[PDB]
Amino acid sequence: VYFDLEDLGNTTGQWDLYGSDAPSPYNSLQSKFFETFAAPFTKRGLLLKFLILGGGSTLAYFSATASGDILPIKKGPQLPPQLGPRLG
Amino acid sequence: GDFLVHHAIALGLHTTTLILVKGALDARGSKLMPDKKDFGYSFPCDGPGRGGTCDISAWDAFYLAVFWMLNTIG
Amino acid sequence: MRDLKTYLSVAPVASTLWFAALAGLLIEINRFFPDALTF
Amino acid sequence: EVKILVDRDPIKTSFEQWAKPGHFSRTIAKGPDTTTWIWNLHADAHDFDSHTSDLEEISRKVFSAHFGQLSIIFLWLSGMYFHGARFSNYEAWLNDPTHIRPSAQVVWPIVGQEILNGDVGGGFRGIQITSGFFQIWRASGITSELQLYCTAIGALVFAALMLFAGWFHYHKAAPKLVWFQDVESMLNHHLAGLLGLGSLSWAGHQIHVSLPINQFLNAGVDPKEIPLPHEFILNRDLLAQLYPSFAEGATPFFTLNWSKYADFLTFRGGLDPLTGGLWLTDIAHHHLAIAILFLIAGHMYRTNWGIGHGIKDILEAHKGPFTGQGHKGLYEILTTSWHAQLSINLAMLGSLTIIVAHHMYAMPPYPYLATDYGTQLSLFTHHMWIGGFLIVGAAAHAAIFMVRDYDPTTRYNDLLDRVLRHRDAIISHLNWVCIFLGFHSFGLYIHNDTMSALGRPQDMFSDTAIQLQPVFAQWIQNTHALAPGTTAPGATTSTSLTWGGGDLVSVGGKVALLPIPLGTADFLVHHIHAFTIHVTVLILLKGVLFARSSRLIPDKANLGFRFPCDGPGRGGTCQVSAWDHVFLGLFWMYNAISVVIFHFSWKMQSDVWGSINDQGVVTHITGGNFAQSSITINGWLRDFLWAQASQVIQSYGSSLSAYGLFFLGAHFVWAFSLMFLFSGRGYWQELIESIVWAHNKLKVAPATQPRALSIVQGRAVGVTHYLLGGIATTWAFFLARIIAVG
Amino acid sequence: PPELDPNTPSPIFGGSTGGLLRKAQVEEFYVITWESPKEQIFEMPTGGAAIMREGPNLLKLARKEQCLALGTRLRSKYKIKYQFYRVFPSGEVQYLHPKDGVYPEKVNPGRQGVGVNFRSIGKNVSPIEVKFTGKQPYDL
Amino acid sequence: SHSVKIYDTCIGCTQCVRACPTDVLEMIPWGGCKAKQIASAPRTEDCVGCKRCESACPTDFLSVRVYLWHETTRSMGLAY
Amino acid sequence: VVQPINGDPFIGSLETPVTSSPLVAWYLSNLPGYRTAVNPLLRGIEVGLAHGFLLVGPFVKAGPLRNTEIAGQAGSLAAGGLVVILSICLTIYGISSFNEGDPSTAPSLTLTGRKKQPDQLQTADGWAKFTGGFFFGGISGVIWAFFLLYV
Amino acid sequence: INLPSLFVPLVGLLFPAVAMASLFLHVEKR
Amino acid sequence: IGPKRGAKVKILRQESYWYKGTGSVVAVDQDPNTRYPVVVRFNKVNYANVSTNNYALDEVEEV
Ligand code: CLA
Ligand code: CLA
Ligand code: CLA
Ligand code: CLA
Ligand code: CLA
Ligand SMILES: CC1=C(/C=C/C(C)=C/C=C/C(C)=C/C=C/C=C(C)/C=C/C=C(C)/C=C/C2=C(C)CCCC2(C)C)C(C)(C)CCC1
Ligand SMILES: CC1=C(/C=C/C(C)=C/C=C/C(C)=C/C=C/C=C(C)/C=C/C=C(C)/C=C/C2=C(C)CCCC2(C)C)C(C)(C)CCC1
Ligand SMILES: CC1=C(C/C=C(\C)CCC[C@H](C)CCC[C@H](C)CCCC(C)C)C(=O)c2ccccc2C1=O
Ligand code: SF4
Ligand code: SF4
Questions:
Q1: How far apart are CA E87 and CA E23, in angstroms?
Q2: Where are the beta strands (DSSP E) in D402-556?
Q3: DSSP characters for D81-141?
Q4: Residue D197, ligand 6, Cβ within 6 A
Q5: How far apart are CA E30 and CA E60, in angstroms?
Q6: F13 is in an annotated binding site
Q7: At D256, which helix (H) or strand (E)?
Q8: How many helices (H) and strands (E) does chain F have?
Q9: Which chain F residue has the Cα nearest residue I30?
Q10: Gene Ontology terms, cellular component aspect (chain H)?
Q11: Which of D599, E11, D510, A51 lies closest to G94 in space, CA to CA?
């Protein structure tokens, strides 16, 4: 009997497929490191300010100082340019 | 050469306006859908009954006419 | 026989015979008077 | 108790029903109220299910209709042999096959159309044929128009006999149902009978007519002076002088000294280097062995005695832990549903035709076929299309079986049920692999086009850049080339000169076959093939698995196989029917086969076909341009379509001008199809109302009230003109190009 | 007085990929019930064949239309009667069909008209006459 | 939810109620036609808008009319 | 062999040797994303570690500088750049999906049907800490691959 | 080059990302 | 009441397939509760393949 009004969670099959509530199997001191070093990135509102502005500034720096050895578009034309079809 | 393609062009003008005039003048209703005005300019259709009614709205006549206008200007 | 004459009158059959006769006529006019551009 | 069971005089022969359009259908028979009647009459003509529900009476209809088809084919062959006899240069072609162009059609002089009678050689003027009949008749040892005349009369007789049998087995002696259901007897009689006695008796002609006459042709003696075929039967010494095995007669056969026949029964392989085709001694030995296999295979199933299986026993005995009851119940399904039979047969017959396309190009079975580039490009393309159409037909009647014949209460089957129970897992998986294939095949081209446009040819997927070598195909090639000395000791040379290795064969300065190289470009176009085929199966297989129901339409099966939709609700349900999946799968089949034949045409002109020098300098038709050009879409636009379209668009004023007109005509029909596919019948019915009014104003309206085509017909008309115009365009493009440069 | 809903057995079915999804946990789902005179194979509206049990029969389904499709098939082929319900994630049940104990095909007193306009269709006003009102011509 | 409406030209033949795949419609007693019944649309929140009902209707000019309107997960026929 | 999912033949799924086998169920219940009672922050650190480390490969070895000496540095920056943009996707996914007070939308039952506390990964803060771990983990994982390959 | 190397990545990478992220949150809000 | 049987009536209902055409009166429902009591037959079917329809007394005109 797979129908029950008092347990609508089992009637619809709302089961955790592979969720294991086993305790943390990590180096517990590395945890204190990860919990206090990765901590400032755990506010989504501030992180969005950070990723948006930090990435925007970083993307701007890398593109502003990109050498000609990397970007043909900044290295520029080297050959002499050829004329237009009607002596243009 | 200029004669032939000018009649091609007159074909395109006449056919495109056919789609568009037929679209405007039947927008309120046709015998296949005499209450079309109650459904508005664009609606998907009126279902497969009465023989089939895909592309029966005035919006669809516009949609068809764009192909003919693109043809003509081409 | 009357059933056959009814079938021979059905739209497709009467059409091929009609258009066959037509094609033969137009072909022979074009064999006798070819290349007519005027008239 | 397998026996002949027939009913006497079931249906009276009468013209009464010829006079009554739509008699087969109770709805249609009442006569037209509207023009829609005209179309349903034709759409339902061969839908024998809708005429009668009696399975016996359905089977009798398909049986006599089959005779009708066989009658038509024989009449078709009669004309082919008759034109070879009466309107051809076949007799002249036998003396000079390297130069004279096969022609078997001559147009009457009217309205300037004589220009289609081209200077094809042999003192003849006609249309160059690409069906390949000349290479067949030569390989059959046919030497005169007299022999074709007699074959044409025999074909005409067989056409009458087949037509008589169709009328006979429907109006006079119509087999009972249980006669058709004796599938054991039929399989035995087709394996041993049709396939077996066909290959054996044809082997006899190859031995006593085809081998000897081709030896004289290849030696150089004039066909008018070659001894007539019956002289090799009346006088054995003629045979024995060509093959001394005939001296001992049928004695070495029964004494198991079969190795004595090694001069006309061989296992050489490769191609006869003076003719360009497979060795006629290898072919005759092929039909011999093949005939043996079928004669014994036609003894597998049980009939009026004890030995043999019941096919039901073999099915009911195969079932696993993942499948449950397995193939139980399939024998009742395949003995009561004609569409289930037709789905399998269309699937295999279609697949087999595509194989015939490959095998006939890489192992040219006819003399002087490999160097008639026009015939060979036609044959491969023709059989690809035939194969692809038959395959798409398998999905329709698989879909038709699910709507009409599937019945889990009477004819259950756990294999079919198991697939229906996880069709969402199948279709979603095929959906993802299609997305993977498309990105990692066509997307690489887009990468290349974008890289090449930006001046960065080092970043392309190319043989001179990031290389995608087809290692596995390359490996198989190098394997078969080493088979004759190693894994196939009896074989002298490889089964095909395509097998990456060996040398080359030329006929008349034209290359026949060389090893076909497979590089990066061949890698890309092969993953296009896998992509296009996958999407074709996705659409078609989805159509059959949800033919009865879906989360969107729980009672879809009640709406029939062929219906436009279930209305604008549920967000819109246009094209939910299985029939609409077949409609969509035709476009994708068309897509897939189009690039397959394009792949074929470009490869052959680039890396295989061409002219060989006095010293061996091969000049290919397009000079190896396939490797660097066929890896971008711009390469196919520019170096393939734009360049090879030269011939057809400058064919006017020459005997190839009919291809010029067909090129433009097929473009037209293709564009015309878009009117149907892009619009909808509501627009058209309203338009017709204004037109009907005008007729009423002048008292000229028909009592058969004009209706727009039905929604489904619109789609059928659309896809039909799309395929006809599309394919005909390539037809006119291929023939003009290959006849002008081949 | 609408029927009840206990915990009757379900038909014999091996399972398919066609059944309930997350919507049932979070929005709603449907259950159809019926009484069959004998065990027999029938087609599941979600694909495949199942065997209904004689007597009571409960079946969960994702949509109302799946229920009515199965039920329509129970009356036609099997000549059995059926009902179904809408079940919410709070356990709240809602009887749906046949509404007033009578199938909607047959007239039945006590039913009140909903959506009946007492005029022919061609008498709807023009859209301009209901512009800037919130009504369509078919609402008056 | 889609809007469904019945007009008084209805002859009460019931064909739309039988066609409906989600039980939107029912017959109710009426004095206006010989059959003394008229259609009614009390459950349009289950209405998907297939218009099977209009296909069924015999009256010159439909007595049952479906006006597709605001979409819900019921009108869109979603099982997910 | 092939059973209905959890014995219910009317749930839209199957239980096959791929979905639920002893080895499959073990490996899937051991991934950091199915550790329902452990800290979501430490889950994301392991996730970012594994992915950022994986992303260095394709960028460096296939990028527009793959055949230059500036290869390892550019694809690594491109690898971290891909981690930066993914962290914005993870962030906006949480801002839109979970509110500051909603409970976990994770299953509160088990395979046997008993009540446990839902995975707090499926909450506003539980997501905010997961994506914070991914970003820190993804940047250091890019650097760790950049450390082993070109240092 | 001193300005295109600034505005081309700004209008073609940053602005669309900021716009796509902004619109994703407005359209998903309730 | 209504037009006699076999009367030739012009149809005046605008939304009718036979609008401004004519049909033949089959019967007139004499029950005064019948809103559309005039049954009319036509010689050509409409788009639903129906050949007969009920009309109001004000929608029909003998000709
Ligand atoms: C697939 C079969 C096939 C095809 C496509 C062709 C095609 C052709 N043949 Mg050929 N032929 C064939 C079989 C075929 N043949 C066979 C089997 C024979 C031996 C009997 C011949 C003997 C033959 C000769 C002797 C000649 C041709 C010729 C031709 C060409 C012109 C024919 C023409 O205009 O007729 C004229 C058109 C008609 C007669 C059609 C008349 C239209 C009527 C009204 C249609 C009747 C429809 C009716 C309802 C059904 C009748 C069925 C009845 C047979 C029971 C054309 C390329 C000619 C040619 O090449 O000239 C250079 C020519 O002289 N053929
Ligand atoms: C003159 C001889 C003759 C006569 C009078 C009849 C009479 C009858 N047959 Mg019979 N039959 C005959 C010969 C004959 N048959 C032959 C030779 C065969 C073998 C094929 C059959 C096979 C047969 C079957 C299988 C069936 C009948 C049926 C019928 C009945 C109605 C058929 C009908 O409407 O035909 C009119 C039909 C046509 C004129 C169609 C033309 C037929 C040919 C084969 C078409 C080929 C055209 C070809 C494709 C070229 C077109 C393509 C191109 C132009 C684009 C009627 C009692 C049917 C019946 O009783 O069911 C109720 C039925 O199911 N017969
Ligand atoms: C041995 C092969 C075979 C056989 C026996 C059948 C038999 C059948 N099919 Mg099937 N089919 C096949 C192959 C086959 N098919 C293939 C290869 C496909 C893929 C294209 C299909 C796709 C298909 C669909 C999609 C449908 C069928 C249907 C049917 C049934 C009705 C057929 C009918 O009345 O048509 C009457 C025949 C016609 C009206 C002919 C129409 C003209 C064609 C389409 C154009 C031909 C163009 C020509 C080649 C070029 C000339 C152009 C020139 C005239 C200018 C019948 C049982 C129908 C059905 O409902 O089954 C129950 C249906 O809807 N089949
Ligand atoms: C050239 C036109 C065209 C294209 C590109 C497609 C594309 C597709 N069709 Mg389709 N189709 C077409 C015409 C076309 N169709 C026509 C004319 C018909 C009518 C018959 C159909 C009928 C049809 C059906 C019935 C089916 C498809 C399917 C598919 C999909 C196959 C899976 C795949 O390769 O995904 C990968 C996508 C591509 C290869 C497209 C190109 C991708 C580009 C190169 C990558 C771009 C990268 C990035 C996004 C850059 C953009 C950035 C920008 C936002 C700034 C795919 C989305 C099947 C499907 O959905 O299977 C999953 C399916 O069942 N189509
Ligand atoms: C009016 C339309 C217009 C258009 C289509 C362009 C197009 C372009 N500009 Mg330009 N620009 C414009 C006005 C415009 N400009 C004006 C008015 C200024 C002075 C304020 C500039 C100053 C400028 C600089 C300094 C640079 C460009 C550059 C560029 C190129 C790259 C895109 C970019 O960085 O934009 C830069 C855009 C701005 C600085 C914003 C100013 C433009 C207005 C304020 C925004 C327009 C909004 C738009 C119309 C929204 C309409 C849709 C709306 C209905 C939703 C591109 C060819 C780059 C280049 O040359 O590449 C090689 C570059 O370096 N632009
Ligand atoms: C091309 C063509 C044709 C023709 C064909 C022909 C010409 C055929 C022939 C055929 C033939 C002419 C055949 C034959 C056959 C034979 C056989 C098939 C045989 C068999 C035999 C056997 C089986 C054997 C047995 C035995 C043994 C085993 C041991 C010892 C004893 C004996 C010897 C008895 C036609 C006109 C139709 C049509 C068109 C095309
Ligand atoms: C596929 C195809 C095709 C082709 C066809 C063919 C080519 C066929 C062949 C076929 C064949 C080629 C067949 C054959 C047959 C044979 C047989 C079947 C025989 C038989 C015989 C017999 C019957 C014998 C008898 C005897 C004797 C004589 C003595 C001893 C004993 C015995 C009894 C054994 C075509 C083009 C149409 C197109 C479509 C598709
Ligand atoms: C153009 C076309 C129209 C109209 C085209 C139809 C009506 C075809 C007309 C076919 C023929 C030409 C009608 C006349 C047939 C008679 C046999 C002609 C007799 C005259 C003699 C010359 C034989 C619609 O029916 C429509 C159907 C649904 C999707 C879109 C399409 C489509 O786009
Ligand atoms: S097919 Fe034509 S009628 Fe049916 S839904 Fe699509 S548009 Fe509406
Ligand atoms: S179908 Fe038309 S007439 Fe028949 S009941 Fe429903 S609305 Fe009234």
A1: 11
A2: 505-507, 510-513
A3: HHHHHHS--HHHHHH-TTTSPPB-----S-TTGGGGSEEEETTEEEPBP-S-HHHHHHHTT
A4: yes
A5: 6
A6: yes
A7: none
A8: 2, 4
A9: F34
A10: chloroplast thylakoid membrane; photosystem I
A11: A51
Give CA–CA dist D723/E12, Å, rounded: 47
**Residues I56, I60, I62: CA angle, nearest 5 degrees:** 145
Q: What tokens does D173 get?
A: 């002696």
Report CA Rg, chain H: 13
Q: What is the rounded distance in angstroms from the CA atom of residue B8 to the CA atom of residue D17?
A: 48
Q: How far apart are CA D713 and CA D704, in angstroms?
A: 18
**Which of F4, F6, F65 has the most ligand 10 atoms within 8 A of CB, as the residue to mutate?**
F6
What CATH number does the domain located at C1-39 have? 1.20.5.510
Are the CB atoms for D384 and D593 separated by under 8 Å?
yes
Ligand 8 atom at minimum distance from C15 CA? 23
Q: Which residue of G has its CA nearest to A10?
A: G113
Chains C and G touch (3+ CB pairs under 8 A): no
Beta strand segments in B1-74, E = none
Q: Token pair 């999946």 is at which residue?
A: D581
3-class SS at F78? coil
Of B17, B55, B20, B56, the C-alpha closest to B37 is: B56
Residue E120, chain F, CB below 8 Å: the answer is yes
Domain residues of chain A, as ranges? 1-88
| Residue-range definition of the domain harbouring residue E80 | 1-140
What length does chain I have? 63
Residue D109 CB contacts under 8 Å (≥ 6 apart), including other chains: none
In order of A66, A67, D454, the CA distances from A76 in angstroms are 13, 11, 14
Number of domains in chain D: 1
Distance CA G55, CA D402 (A): 48
Letter for the amino acid at D737? R
How are strands ordered across the β-sheet holding D505-507? D505-507, D510-513, D610-611, D619-620
Way the structure was solved? X-ray
Within 8 A by CB and 6+ apart from D524, the residues are D441, D444, D445, D461, D468, D630, D631
- Structural domains of chain G in order of their starting residue, each with its CATH number: 3-150 (1.20.1240.10)
Q: Is F33 annotated as a binding residue?
A: no
For residue I19, give both structure tokens.
């609008």
> Angle at the Cα of D365 (from D359 to D366), degrees rounded to 5?
140
**Taking the alpha carbons of G118, G123, G129, G132 in that order, is the dihedral positive or negative?**
positive
Between CA I61 and CA I63 the distance in angstroms is 6
List phi, psi (to 5°) of D672: -60, -35
Written as one string, the DSSP assignment of chain E is: -------PPPPB----TTSB-HHHHHT-EEEEEEEESS-EEEE-TTSSEEEEPBEEEEEEESSHHHHHHHHHHIIIII---EEEEEE-TTS-EEEEESTTSS-TTS--TTPPP-SEESS-GGGPPPGGGGTTSS--TTT-
Residues D670, D674, D679, CA angle at the centre, nearest 5°? 160
The alpha carbon of residue F32 is apart from the nearest alpha carbon of chain D, in Å, by: 31
Distance CA D336, CA G125 (A): 64
Q: Measuring CA to CA, which residue among D308, D325, D328 is closest to residue D316?
A: D328
| Structure tokens given for G76 | 């690594």
DSSP state of G11: B
CA-only gyration radius of chain I, Å: 11
Helix (H) or strand (E) holding D385: helix D373-404
Q: Per DSSP, what are the bridge partners of residue D466?
A: D461
Report d(CA D190, CA D512) in Å as an integer. 36
From residue D108, alpha-carbon distances to D65, D477, D732, H3 in Å are 35, 50, 22, 75
Secondary structure of residue I22 in the 3-state scheme: strand
Q: What CA–CA distance (Å, rounded) separates F18 from D555?
A: 14
DSSP string, D562-603: S---S-S-TT--TT-SHHHHHHHHHHHHHHHHHHHHHHHHHH
